[PDB]
A paper describes a structure:
A key group of these are the respiratory chain supercomplexes (SCs); these which primarily consist of complexes I, III2 and IV (CI, CIII2 and CIV) in varying stoichiometries, which serve as the minimal functional units for NADH:O2 oxidoreduction. Here we report in situ structures of porcine respiratory SCs, determined directly through imaging porcine mitochondria by single-particle analysis combined with cryo-electron tomography (cryo-ET). Our structures, with an average resolution of approximately 2.5 Å and local resolution up to 1.8 Å in the best regions, enable in-depth study of mitochondrial respiratory SCs in their native states. Our in situ structures also capture numerous reactive intermediates within these respiratory supercomplexes, shedding light on the dynamic processes of the ubiquinone/ubiquinol exchange mechanism in complex I and the Q-cycle in complex III.
Author numbering:
A (entry chain 1H): 1 to 318
B (entry chain 1e): 1 to 99
C (entry chain 1A): 1 to 115
D (entry chain 1K): 1 to 98
E (entry chain 1D): 21 to 272
F (entry chain 1a): 1 to 70
G (entry chain 1b): 1 to 83
H (entry chain 1J): 1 to 175
The structure:
């Protein structure tokens, strides 16, 4: 029944992404005095179905000045990596117990550049070619901060086994020990998913869309699926990493409920931030991390590597 | 080395890793710790162009421990004959070879 | 097997989505659609010209920092060593060198996004 | 010496051919050069994991760290010929003649 | 030398070759013309060394109507709505300008109540237009909420516009010789309630934008305009007041 | 009227709910009611292999106590 | 005196992130030497027996080495229990 | 049969390398390198090198990212090359396919291929070693020994990375 | 027979299109501001599945909002010609529908229809936000009465 | 809180390890017998395999040293079933 478990992982994530496209249009609207979609079915519950059907049966235009190979491969990479990057998550019993789950998923997180670059260049438009390099620079320059933050946080966990992370927290929420770190991490997450405060790639004055310009219908919707699957996946990552929960082995459902509630809360915080803040400028965008975020992250990592030694509280390796 | 500062001024700088019978982390021995111990302690203070011939049998035993060229070739010959006579059909593998 | 089975399932699923996306809909296939786009116009004679740029330096210092991030990655395993004092001093050396490279990047324009 | 060793050695031999036998591109050539070190990285990791050379386990990343540095300057040199000359096509790359 | 050595020019003494064909370029951008992030019509042919803009070239005419040719075929009474449709965020202000010109020609003054209605509705127009500017600016910069929050109040303004003239946007109200007709009964009370309620959202917009880090950083001290160079350039309104010249036609 | 959003995320919650117990239950389903025996180190793998051999049914999660031995 | 304090104040105002990072970093190096528990961390790491304690061949006159794994004499880690 | 995967992982490594070295459009050489690295990560992984495999995954899929970063910046042109543009690239590619194919055919028939060194065609599963690891991964512990026994290695590296950022500064400074 | 299945299927498809039309804004004059008021809290276009914001590549309907001048016409033409099928264009405002106040100009085309096909003619100067919204609803009912696969099956 | 909980986790790890040292001798004592059983079974079977071959000295050791070496896993899982060798090599790597 292994493949059944796989499918029970993919398909519900697909419905989650689908209805995220409704909850965002409702949350944003209510945040800005709009009722949101409530015409397609009860309370707009059916609205994601209609737009999905439209985008499936919308004409997918072939970019005439393009090589179709990457125009098709880039959605494949963006979507497949986004879903397979859900594989090693510690649900009460994680699907795949990869001994280096956190490093596994961090490494796959860097692969979104490998959809961004082919989308931006293959489509062969000025907006596309600009936004490809700009977004690539964004995500790569924030991946480093993600890396040192992950290392510094893990130095108190014990290993790269992402199932034992729960065992690390157990008593207290891990944010209580690394709230300065998480505050950076969360924001860098906001940067890596290209969200309204840090998106910089859409920029609907000078980049319009940046990467998903010439993409239409299906391949276009695939990059949205990747984008709004990374939202849930990284919010869940942050949820377990800092917002711990209880897990009794005889009752696996308890940790499941707590974890999904944490993920929903963090995604709502994502929508909350985007509904309010203005959008960064590329100059300030890289100034935020090179000038400000990176030195603080380096110093915090030094603090969090020296701390277990002086307290004689090194975490258990196994 | 050309100018061996390592033993002159008295510290190891790279000699810790050079061979795999050294003190490995948490005493994790190498695959061929015994063979290379035999080879190294065989050829000590003897001279390379003299030790290469006295410590020969140790050396090829060490190399065969590293690569298993001869042993895997022997296995390949055994598998060849087994498959040949099985295809031409004389005996059947005993149940320990099936389950 | 298991892990490889999940990767296979995901890649095939993605490919079915793109196949339905690119094959199911119907297009009249008329010529003037192929004209490219820029906020109403087309991108004149560009979108493939060599890109006279400046943040190349940021792009390359990314990689140069990524090597050192790889170097400091083994830390969680490294903290489980007998001689913790040497590990502490030498890891601190690594992060100090990180900071020094960043500082030289800083004062000597460098990480300052070139103009 | 099993087939995995043949395959990565043979991959290195064709990387040697591809980088060293230039066709027309400097960027693609240094790309072949950095693929060369990938082949050597895999090759090195093979024996090291095979023989339980516990210390030498750190040699690949070490071997890695320097190698990218080469590419770190290589492409860095590539821009410096590019802004003046225009492309990475090495056939105009002829000014230094005598 | 044998043969091909003839085509082996000696290197220069500096060791630097004569600089080759000028590749200096700033990669002209058209930045339009649909580009709905310009209120819909605009063209900026920009010349830029990548990021710092070297030299821009706006192309107005993308919404060109022969209104200035159109006026001298209709009477003034028929010419009034052109100004209403001219600066369509400050309708009653344009009508005030045109009407004041007209009965300045006629040596006629509007009745005092006409003056008071004119100034009251011109100030309502000022509120409308400033809401336009600030909210749509925040939309360009990225802020979406201040758009809709103040646009509900703008709709409330449109209700008054409808209740006085008859159309929520293009009033044709302020005519030469005073306003067209009196206000409906109860309009003043509703204006009073709206004015009571408005400041509590004006400050609300302020708190979101004024002290915010990234609203300031994207906007503070970008594109300075010198006070001397402002007035020679024909700049007017807040453009002058932003720089520092104490000038305002409402007072002087 | 924020509760109009409540249906919207509720199914979303259910959408993220299913991967929780599904993986949790199937493990419990597959390993004889026990949860999966994670093998993060070769000692765990050797223990699992010896359990599989001792079971005699090629099923590691089948376990026999002292009643199996003399 | 006054110049140093004023420069610290300006740094705490002009680039607050820089001073915070420099401070917490400067602590990160000087506490581990000062702290009295790093030796206890070394004891933690040496306590864990990743491998088997292979016994010694008994021949007489090693009172230090316990004869039995339950014997009283030998290395003990009651400090570990109290810690 | 998924027996031969540990073989084929290397095999797809070879022919993904040839097209990578077939001198195609720079991005297509990059794609060849990308598939080669992705399939070689499996080669190191199934040998037990989990950390090193994921490590090369991360750093190398950033490293080819940056070499892309100038491919669209300092290497593109009006008409970018295509993996079918030049006629010779097909010949290079097919010469890539038939050589190791003939050699593996021989290694499947004679198992004593004479090319360069001495090689046996009897798979790769043999060369593994029986044993155990207790409660520690050998690869992770070995790479962790960098901060205890890698006295000189980390020092010389960090010095080299500092000098590297210095030279990267100086050569690209543009006076 | 086949009408049952094909009608149910194409009814599904045209419903999906009807409830998810994406405007391509395109505001040229005061009609743009009135449309913006129509997306304000009060009327809340975004409720009906319309999304107002849409790049011309991913959009279903163009609202020609304002006077269309001669200088604009090639740009609007290139915008519509790139618009993926299906593409229904609604003209708002007397100016865009035909002529306008500036009907007898020298650099204003006398109607968007002379430039691009118009699916719904929305009158008003400006058409008050809810009148625009009603035009959008009329286009929605037009999408409801869509028999693509019926005509295919009965060609 | 993390200091005290991590100390408790170190206590749990030393306890689990002490169990591992307690049980290591039995696993070693079963493993050497199991490996020798594979070796002897392969030796007897390969003896019948090699009777026909004119030049194959049965049971020979390629190594000149008389010291016993850890059997190379190839001859361990040799003529055995393909699933057995597949597990023995790639089980830990493939296990999840
Ligand atoms: C005066 O001056 C002015 C300016 O300047 C000077 C201006 O600038 C502007 C311009 C300003 C604007 C246009 C303002 C826009 C305002 C609005 C109210 C409209 C936008 C409203 C929003 C709520 C914002 C929405 C945007 C978001 C969230 C992100 C933006 C970025 C993107 C990349 C999104 C772009 C759109 C995309 C990608 C299309 C959406 C596609 C989908 C939702 C696909 C969904 C697919 C699925 C669900 C698939 C799964 C389906 C199913 C059924 C699951 C089950 C199936 C299985 C197989 C299992 C103006 C007007 C102005 O006045
Ligand atoms: C295979 C190909 C298709 C793949 C997609 C899935 C199958 C097709 C879509 C099925 C659902 C939608 C069918 C069409 C509905 C429609 O047109 O109107 C619906 C309508 C919506 O009505 P309405 O509000 O649009 O009506 C018009 C309103 N005015 C006049 C104001 C404009 O509702 C119904 O028919 C009632 C049942 C709705 C669904 C009940 C369950 C909802 C809760 C669960 C939601 C999530 C799980 C699903
Ligand atoms: C999951 C989605 C399940 C439903 C899939 C519906 C697919 C609809 C495709 C788009 C509309 C075209 C269609 O239905 O048939 C194509 C048919 C194709 O044959 P046609 O002759 O009707 O096409 C129109 C006329 N020409 C060919 C000139 C364009 O077109 C129509 O139905 C449109 C009328
Ligand atoms: S129809 Fe009226 S509101 Fe619309 S653009 Fe023309 S004058 Fe302006």
């Amino acid at each position: 029944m292994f493949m059944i478990n796989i499918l029970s992982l993919i398909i519900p994530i697909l419905l989650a992404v689908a209805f995220l496209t409704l909850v965002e249009r409702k949350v944003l609207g209510y945040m800005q005095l709009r009722k949101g979609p409530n015409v397609v079915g009860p309370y707009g519950l059916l609205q994601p179905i209609a737009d999905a059907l439209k985008l499936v049966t919308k004409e997918p235009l072939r970019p005439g000045t393009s090589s179709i190979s990457m125009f098709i491969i880039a959605p494949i990479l963006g979507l497949s990596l986004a879903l397979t990057m859900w594989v090693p998550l510690p649900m009460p019993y994680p699907l795949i117990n990869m001994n280096l789950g956190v490093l596994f998923m961090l490494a796959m997180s860097s692969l979104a550049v490998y959809s961004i670059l082919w989308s931006g260049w293959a489509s062969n438009s000025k907006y596309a070619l600009i936004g490809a390099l700009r977004a690539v620079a964004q995500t790569i320059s924030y991946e480093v901060t993600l890396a040192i933050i992950l290392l510094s946080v893990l130095l108190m966990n014990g290993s790269y086994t992402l199932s034992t992370l729960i065992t690390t927290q157990e008593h207290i929420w891990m944010i209580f020990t690394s709230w300065p770190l998480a505050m950076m991490w969360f924001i860098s997450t906001l940067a890596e998913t290209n969200r309204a405060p840090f998106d910089l790639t859409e920029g609907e004055s000078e980049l319009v869309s940046g990467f998903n310009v010439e993409y239409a219908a299906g391949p276009f919707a695939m990059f949205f699926m990747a984008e709004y699957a990374n939202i849930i996946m990284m919010n869940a990552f942050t949820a377990i990493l800092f917002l711990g929960a209880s897990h009794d082995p005889h009752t696996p459902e308890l940790y499941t409920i707590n974890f999904v509630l944490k993920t929903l809360a963090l995604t709502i915080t994502f929508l909350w931030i985007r509904a309010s803040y203005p959008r960064f400028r590329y100059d300030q965008l890289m100034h935020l991390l090179w000038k400000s975020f990176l030195p603080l992250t380096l110093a915090l990592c030094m603090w969090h590597i020296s701390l277990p030694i002086m307290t004689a509280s090194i975490p258990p390796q196994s | 080395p050309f100018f061996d500062v390592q033993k002159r001024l008295g510290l190891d700088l790279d000699r810790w890793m050079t061979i795999q019978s050294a003190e490995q982390p948490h005493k994790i021995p190498g695959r061929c710790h015994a063979f290379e111990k035999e080879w190294i302690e065989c050829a000590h203070g003897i001279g390379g162009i003299r030790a290469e011939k006295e410590c020969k049998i140790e050396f090829d035993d060490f190399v065969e421990c590293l690569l298993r060229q001869k042993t895997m070739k022997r296995l390949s010959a055994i598998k060849r004959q087994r498959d040949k006579l099985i295809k031409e059909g004389k005996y059947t593998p005993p149940p320990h070879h099936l389950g | 097997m298991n892990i490889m089975l999940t990767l296979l399932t995901n890649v095939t699923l993605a490919s079915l989505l793109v196949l339905i996306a690119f094959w199911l809909p119907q297009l009249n296939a008329y010529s003037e659609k192929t004209s490219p786009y820029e906020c109403g116009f087309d991108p004149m004679g560009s979108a493939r010209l060599p890109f006279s740029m400046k943040f190349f330096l940021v792009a390359i210092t990314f990689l140069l920092f990524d090597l050192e991030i790889a170097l400091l990655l083994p830390l969680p395993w490294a903290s489980q060593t007998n001689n913790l004092k040497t590990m502490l001093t030498m890891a601190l050396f690594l992060l100090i060198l990180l900071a020094a490279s960043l500082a030289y990047e800083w004062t000597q324009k460098g990480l300052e996004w070139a103009e | 010496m099993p087939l995995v060793y043949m395959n990565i050695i043979m991959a290195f031999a064709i990387a040697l051919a591809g980088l060293l036998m230039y066709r027309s591109h400097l960027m693609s050539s240094l790309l072949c050069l950095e693929g060369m070190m990938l082949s050597l990285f895999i090759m090195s990791t093979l024996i090291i994991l095979n023989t339980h050379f516990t210390l030498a386990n750190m040699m690949p990343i070490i071997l890695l760290v320097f190698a990218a540095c080469e590419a770190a300057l290589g492409l860095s040199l590539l821009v410096m010929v590019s802004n003046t000359y225009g492309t990475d096509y090495v056939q105009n790359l002829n000014l230094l003649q005598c | 030398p044998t043969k091909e050595t003839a085509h082996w020019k000696p290197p220069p003494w500096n060791d630097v070759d004569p600089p080759k064909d000028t590749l200096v370029s700033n990669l002209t951008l058209n930045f339009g013309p649909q580009h709905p992030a310009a209120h819909g019509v605009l063209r900026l042919v920009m010349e830029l060394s990548g990021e710092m803009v070297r030299k821009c070239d706006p192309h107005i005419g993308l919404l060109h109507r022969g209104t200035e040719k159109l006026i001298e075929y209709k009477t003034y009474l028929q010419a009034l709505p052109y100004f209403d449709r001219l600066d369509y965020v400050s309708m009653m202000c344009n009508e005030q300008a045109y009407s004041l010109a007209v009965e300045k020609l006629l040596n006629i003054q509007p009745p005092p109540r006409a003056q008071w209605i004119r100034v009251l509705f011109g100030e309502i127009t000022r509120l409308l237009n400033h809401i336009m500017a600030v909210t749509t600016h925040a939309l360009d910069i990225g802020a979406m909420t201040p758009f809709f929050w103040m646009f509900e109040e703008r709709e409330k303004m449109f209700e008054f516009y409808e209740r006085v003239s008859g159309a929520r946007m293009h009033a044709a109200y302020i005519r030469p010789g005073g306003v067209h007709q009196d206000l409906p009964l109860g309009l003043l009370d509703d204006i009073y309630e709206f004015s009571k309620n408005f400041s509590f959202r004006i400050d609300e917009l302020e708190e979101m934008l004024t002290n915010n880090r990234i609203w300031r950083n994207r906007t503070v001290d970008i594109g300075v305009v010198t006070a001397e160079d402002a007035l020679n350039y024909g700049f007017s309104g807040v453009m002058l007041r932003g720089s520092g010249i104490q000038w305002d036609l409402r007072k002087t | 009227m924020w509760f109009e959003i409540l249906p919207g995320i509720a199914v979303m919650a259910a959408c993220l709910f299913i991967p929780g117990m599904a993986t949790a239950h199937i493990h419990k389903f597959t390993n004889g009611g026990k949860e999966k025996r994670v093998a993060h180190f070769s000692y765990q793998w050797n223990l699992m292999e010896r359990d599989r051999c001792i079971s005699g049914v090629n099923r590691y999660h089948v376990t026999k106590g002292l009643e199996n031995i003399d | 005196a006054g110049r140093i304090a004023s420069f610290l104040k300006n740094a705490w105002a002009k680039e607050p992130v820089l001073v915070a990072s420099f401070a917490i970093g400067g602590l990160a190096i000087i506490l581990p030497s000062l702290s009295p528990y790093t030796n206890y961390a070394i004891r933690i790491n040496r306590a864990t027996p990743y491998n088997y304690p292979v016994p010694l061949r008994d021949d007489g006159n090693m009172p230090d080495v316990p004869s039995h794994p339950q014997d009283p004499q030998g290395p003990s880690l009651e400090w570990l229990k109290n810690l | 049969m998924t027996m031969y995967i540990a073989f084929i992982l290397s095999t797809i490594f070879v022919i993904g390398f040839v097209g990578f070295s077939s001198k195609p459009s720079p991005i297509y050489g990059g794609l060849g390198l990308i598939v080669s690295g992705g399939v070689g990560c499996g080669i190191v992984l199934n040998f037990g090198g989990s950390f090193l495999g994921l490590m090369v995954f991360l750093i190398y899929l950033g490293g080819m990212l940056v070499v892309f970063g100038y491919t669209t910046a300092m290497a593109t042109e009006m008409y970018p090359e295509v993996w079918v543009s030049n006629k010779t690239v097909f010949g290079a590619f097919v010469s890539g396919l038939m050589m190791e194919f003939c050699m593996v055919y021989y290694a499947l028939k004679e198992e004593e291929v004479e090319i360069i060194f001495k090689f046996n065609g009897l798979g790769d599963w043999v060369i593994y070693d029986t044993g155990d690891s207790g409660f520690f991964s050998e690869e992770a512990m070995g790479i962790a020994a960098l901060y205890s026994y890698g006295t000189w290695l980390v020092i010389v590296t960090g010095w080299s990375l500092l000098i590297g950022v210095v030279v990267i500064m100086e050569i690209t400074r543009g006076n | 027979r086949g009408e049952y299945v094909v009608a149910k299927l194409d009814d599904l498809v045209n419903w999906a299109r009807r409830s998810s039309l994406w405007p391509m804004t395109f505001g040229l004059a005061c009609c743009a501001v009135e449309m913006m008021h129509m997306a304000a809290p009060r009327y809340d276009m975004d409720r009906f599945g319309v999304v107002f914001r849409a790049s011309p590549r991913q959009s279903d309907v163009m609202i020609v909002a304002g006077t269309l001048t001669n200088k604009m016409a090639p740009a609007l033409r290139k915008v519509y010609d790139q618009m993926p099928e299906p593409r229904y264009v609604v003209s708002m405002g007397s100016c865009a529908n035909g002529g306008g106040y500036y009907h007898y100009s020298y650099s204003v085309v006398r109607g968007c229809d002379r430039i691009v096909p118009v699916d719904i003619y929305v009158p008003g100067c400006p058409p008050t936000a809810e009148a625009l919204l009603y035009g959008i609803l009329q286009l929605q009912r037009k999408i409801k009465r869509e028999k693509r696969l019926r005509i295919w099956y009965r060609r | 809180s993390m200091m005290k909980w991590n100390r408790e986790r170190r206590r749990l790890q030393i306890e689990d390890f002490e169990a591992r040292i307690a049980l290591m001798p039995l696993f070693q004592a079963e493993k050497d017998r199991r490996v020798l059983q594979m070796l002897r079974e392969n030796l007897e079977e390969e003896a019948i395999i090699m009777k026909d071959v004119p030049d194959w000295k049965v049971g020979e050791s390629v190594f000149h040293t008389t010291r016993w070496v850890t059997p190379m896993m190839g001859e361990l899982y040799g003529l055995r079933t393909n699933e057995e060798i597949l597990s023995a090599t790639y089980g830990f790597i493939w296990y999840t």
